[PDB]
């Protein structure tokens, strides 16, 4: 089952597959059988779903055998399985939307501690694999903290989030 | 009958539309009698699909028919 990882605010593109290369009808449905977008011939409609204003597609490439599902401003609340229904198949993919950041926005000093906040989608076990230019490649679960925060810790730390062998990079704000 | 330069008016006689709407809703009730039928407007999309469109006299009329499918319906008017 195809799985994708979002950054809780970026865009996502859900692509199906086809071979007949004629832009045949297609649909997207969640795990609860809810329509989000829609196709009636060659037009593009948006069904009464929570993702009415976020769904997007590449219409010019419909005749080339693609129907990528572009969604803008990804949020954790939209993580659900979606199904491709081009002709007779039920191809299914999943999205995992979460957010990684830090609690201390700007107020920081030398010799202080640092903590990270991770909000994973309901029903996920993300792992935080921090990577730092100074060699502080912290490894841990969803929540990770740093006991030292000095001037040498300058620069945004890239604490990646990995799960199911799929990993996405992130940045950490550090101002002192 | 719809007539009229970006403004025009279409006519709908509720006195004759109500009968057809009632027949259609009554027939729909058979398929799902346990359900309560509620109408509404479109969910959004292309301007040629969400709002009614037609080609008349070399003109591409787009008429907004929202105030005809939003009202809910029941066994009584």
């Amino acid at each position, epitope marked *: 089952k195809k799985v994708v990882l979002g950054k809780k605010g970026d865009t996502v593109e859900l692509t199906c597959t086809a071979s007949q290369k004629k832009s045949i009808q297609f649909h997207w449905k969640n795990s609860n059988q809810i329509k989000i977008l829609g196709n009636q011939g060659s037009f593009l409609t948006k069904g009464p779903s929570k993702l009415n204003d976020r769904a*997007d597609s590449r219409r010019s490439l419909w005749d080339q055998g693609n129907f990528p599902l572009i969604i803008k401003n990804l949020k954790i609340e939209d993580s659900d399985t979606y199904i491709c229904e081009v002709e007779d198949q039920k191809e299914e993919v999943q999205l995992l939307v979460f957010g990684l950041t830090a609690n201390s926005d700007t107020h920081l000093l030398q010799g202080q501690s640092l903590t990270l906040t991770l909000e994973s989608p309901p029903g996920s076990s993300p792992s935080v694999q921090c990577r730092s230019p100074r060699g502080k490649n912290i490894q841990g679960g969803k929540t990770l903290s740093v006991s030292q925060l000095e001037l040498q810790d300058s620069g945004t730390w890239t604490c990646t989030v990995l799960q199911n062998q799929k990993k996405v990079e992130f940045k950490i704000d550090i101002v002192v | 009958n719809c007539t009229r*330069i970006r*403004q025009a008016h279409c006519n709908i006689s509720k006195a004759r539309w109500n009968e057809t709407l009632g027949q259609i809703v009554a027939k729909l009730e058979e398929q799902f009698p346990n359900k309560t039928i509620i109408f509404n407007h479109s969910s959004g*999309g*292309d*301007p040629e699909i*969400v709002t009614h469109s037609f080609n008349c006299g070399g003109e591409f009329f787009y008429c907004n028919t929202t105030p005809l499918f939003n009202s809910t319906w029941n066994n009584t008017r």
Partner: antibody
Amino acid sequence: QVQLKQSGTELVRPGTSVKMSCKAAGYTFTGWVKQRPGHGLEWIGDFYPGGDYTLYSENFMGKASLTAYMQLSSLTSEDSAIYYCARGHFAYWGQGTLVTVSS
Amino acid sequence: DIVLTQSPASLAVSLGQRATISCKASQSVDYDGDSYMNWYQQKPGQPPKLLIYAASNLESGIPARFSGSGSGTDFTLNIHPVGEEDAATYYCQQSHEDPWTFGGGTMLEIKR
């Protein structure tokens, strides 16, 4: 009724980036213009929501990064002017936002 | 780019008379019978208002007094009869191809 509404008056410092917004109503959400005295009207660029397509004139590359929004970078005294939002196909333009580039 | 030249720079017309403004393009704009020229009117404190589009048709809400004629690289915007409210700056713009350029402007003064 096709309607577009822009943000209020803005006063920003040179060298920074200032972002304006234009709202819409009465049609499907899915053009920018600059007017300066002695210059007339200059069509800045065009963009398309629901896919975010970009298009610029020769004198706007790297200067602008565009409910829709616009962001003008490398602000200078020349950018002090009024700006109009206009949904492209320009049927209607925004009322106008006055931007003053000064410290 | 397509360069638009307007004429005259300043125009004064008595109330009720005919006001004509010419716009010339550096390149041919006709595309098999159609001209993709636009003419806009602007007044202080207001955004430009589409007066003429397609070079031969009247925009909705625009009085029929405004009209357009010509072809090739020579077009004319004509106002007849001219009124007090007509005081404004008229601009000619080209939609023949990108980049989408604009005219030099032409102020209309209601001589009284």
